[PDB]
């Protein structure tokens, strides 16, 4: 039953491909190839050579046709692309074919492209092809860091398809300005907030470790000591919070907190046994760091 109708399809794809190649060596760069590849690419967007062919036709027709007949072909092509992306929203060549197409338009509608990224991110908020194409579009349309950072601020808070959006933030932020103390402590806030909502959403934690890695100051040491307690209240079996406390104590006074650093490593191993070997090496590295530090005493 189902084999019939899908041997039907293979037959037709298989003959269409043949005819496309025949046409190609002969050099029939025409509408007939656009029509044949349409058949094929619609069912198989990863057939890269066919996006190549389309491109060559459109460029060949692009001259020996009226700028009205060209324009019709561009519109026809954008809708074919979108229809292909709804089929395979991960196709590298489908997305890059749209990149080529938009890049060569004399007057491209980027707002419509950004809306398309919206739609695709609604379907799959982690689709990295779409985030890339979004950054392509934001750069072609010179969208400014703060506009994008609002878009990101609306796709983390409302909903938690977070990591791809917090990454984008990570890149957009430095573009507003070893990142400023004032901004750092402001992000320590947004992130310390983040992990009292879902302390088991990991984006905030990954992000916060960057923020620590990247003067103590009464201002900062107090925010870190504060963080450390906020974290201890939260410990009332969350591995991310436990690692962070070790790293905060490390951040604060590693010689002073050596005892507690060791306690924490123990609890953390029991909570996150898969990371036993990492945590051992991290503990060894801290212990050595400390022995170096104790040799600062005379």
């Amino acid at each position: 039953a189902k084999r019939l109708e899908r041997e039907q399809k293979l037959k037709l794809y298989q003959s269409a491909t043949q005819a496309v190649f025949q046409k190609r060596q002969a050099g029939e760069l025409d509408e007939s190839v656009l029509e044949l590849t349409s058949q094929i690419l619609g069912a198989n967007p990863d057939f890269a050579t066919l996006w190549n062919c389309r491109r060559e036709v459109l460029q060949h027709l692009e001259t020996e046709k009226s700028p009205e007949e060209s324009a019709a072909l561009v519109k026809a092509e954008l809708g074919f692309l979108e229809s292909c992306l709804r089929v395979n929203p991960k196709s590298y060549g489908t997305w890059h074919h749209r990149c080529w197409l938009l890049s060569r338009l004399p007057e491209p509608n980027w707002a419509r492209e950004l809306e398309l990224c919206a739609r695709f991110l609604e379907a799959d908020e982690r689709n990295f092809h779409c985030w890339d194409y979004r950054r392509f579009v934001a750069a072609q349309a010179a969208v400014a860091p703060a506009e994008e950072l609002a878009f990101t601020d609306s796709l983390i808070t409302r909903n938690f398809s977070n990591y791809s959006s917090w990454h984008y933030r990570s890149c957009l932020l430095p573009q507003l300005h070893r990142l400023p103390e004032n901004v750092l402590l402001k992000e320590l806030e947004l992130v310390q907030n983040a992990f009292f909502t879902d302390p088991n959403d990991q984006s905030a934690w990954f992000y916060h470790r960057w923020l620590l890695g990247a003067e103590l100051s009464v201002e900062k040491s107090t925010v870190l000591q504060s963080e450390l307690e906020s974290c201890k209240e939260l410990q009332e079996e969350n591995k991310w919070c436990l690692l962070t406390i070790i790293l905060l104590m490390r951040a604060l006074d590693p010689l002073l907190y050596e005892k507690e650093t060791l306690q924490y490593f123990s609890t953390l191993k029991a909570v996150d046994p898969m990371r036993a070997a990492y945590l051992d090496d991290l503990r060894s590295k801290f212990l050595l760091e400390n022995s170096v530090l104790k040799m600062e005493y005379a």
């Binding site: 293979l10 794809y13 298989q14 190649f21 190609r24 069912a43 198989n44 990863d46 057939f47 890269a48 050579t49 996006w51 190549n52 491109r55 590298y92 060549g93 890059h96 990149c99 080529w100 982690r126 990295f128 985030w131 890339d132 950054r135 977070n162 990591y163 791809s164 990454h167 984008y168 990570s170 890149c171 088991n200 959403d201 990991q202 984006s203 990954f206 992000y207 960057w210 890695g213 046994p273 898969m274 990371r275 036993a276 070997a277 990492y278 090496d281 991290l282 590295k285």
Partner: protein, 322 residues
């Protein structure tokens, strides 16, 4: 916490003879996938050779297919009548190295093709249509390393482009600004191995990001809060071995995941247990096991995803972290 649960009745045994037959007899999906054919051929040969079974494939036939796929520019297509691309260029060169048949194609023109794809910023396009990806940075230098011709490209600008795809979390994406992804981290770490720039990786940080790919089922994902997939057994492991932190994942849980992904009836591995197998997931399941020290599988270069012994023969073995 989106993860697979592994079931009682998931295979817990390495089924090499099935994987050999599955690969030996593949294409008898195959038709929609002619566009990747050269790479499928690489995937099949590499997994067969790692499993000791390379003789069961058709050397002479393949040597002729490759030659027919070298275009006059020097690039190699996925298949006959298809257009050349960096991907299938790497794959072909790997196959010929597998077979010690470099002379089959024009080496000088491959080198020139790859040389032609580098951009001002050091990045590589995959072809003349210009898609930039860190994949292509890896494919470029991997190809040239195997031909002894790494000095054909602008290494410094290459390195710089790659390092510019390094992210807050210590990982790498496709392009500058892109989200870290185990796949692109493999490419970038592989690339820095080839170019002797591993001291620029923050190894403890990236190694931590990588080991956090491992989920309670033992399986690995490509980035935070995504589903696991056996092919990441390759992307993540290869990356960790390269930066000397392979031991940061739980090897037994991972191994249990990888075996759980086999199809006991037909052979092959799938992305996750009980799904339809394919050759790609079959290579990366086997290459992942080899990275963890499975005895029936030849050791695999974590950089080149080819048997160590092949690379020993050509004397291209990038020094790794530790």
């Amino acid at each position: 916490q989106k993860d697979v649960t592994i079931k009682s009745d998931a295979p817990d045994t390495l089924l090499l003879e099935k994987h050999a037959d599955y690969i030996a007899s593949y294409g008898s999906e195959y038709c929609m996938s002619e566009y990747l054919r050269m790479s499928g051929v690489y995937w099949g040969l590499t997994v067969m050779d790692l499993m000791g079974q390379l003789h069961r494939m058709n050397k002479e036939e393949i040597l002729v297919f490759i030659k027919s796929c070298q275009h006059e520019c020097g690039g190699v297509s996925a298949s006959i009548g298809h257009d050349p691309h960096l991907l299938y260029t790497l794959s072909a060169v790997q196959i010929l190295t597998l077979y010690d048949s470099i002379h089959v194609i024009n080496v000088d023109k491959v080198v020139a093709y790859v040389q032609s794809l580098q951009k001002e910023d050091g990045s590589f396009a995959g072809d003349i249509w210009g898609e930039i990806d860190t994949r292509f940075s890896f494919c470029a230098v991997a190809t040239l390393a195997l031909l002894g011709k790494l000095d054909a490209i602008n290494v410094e600008k290459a390195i710089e482009f790659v390092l510019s795809c390094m992210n807050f979390d210590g990982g790498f994406g496709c392009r500058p600004g892109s989200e870290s992804h185990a796949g692109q981290i493999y490419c970038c770490t592989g690339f820095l191995a080839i170019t002797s720039q591993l001291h620029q990786v923050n190894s403890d940080l990236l190694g931590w990001w990588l080991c956090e790919r491992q989920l309670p089922s033992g399986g690995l994902n490509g980035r935070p809060e995504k589903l696991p997939d056996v092919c990441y057994s390759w992307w993540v492991l290869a990356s960790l071995k390269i930066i000397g932190r392979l031991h940061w994942i739980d090897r037994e849980k991972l191994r249990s995941f990888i075996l759980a992904c086999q199809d006991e009836e037909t052979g092959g591995f799938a992305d996750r247990p009980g799904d339809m197998v394919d050759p790609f997931h079959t290579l990366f399941g086997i290459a992942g096991l080899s990275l963890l020290g499975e005895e029936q599988i030849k050791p695999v270069s974590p950089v080149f995803c080819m048997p160590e012994e092949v690379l020993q023969r050509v004397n291209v073995q990038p020094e790794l972290v530790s």
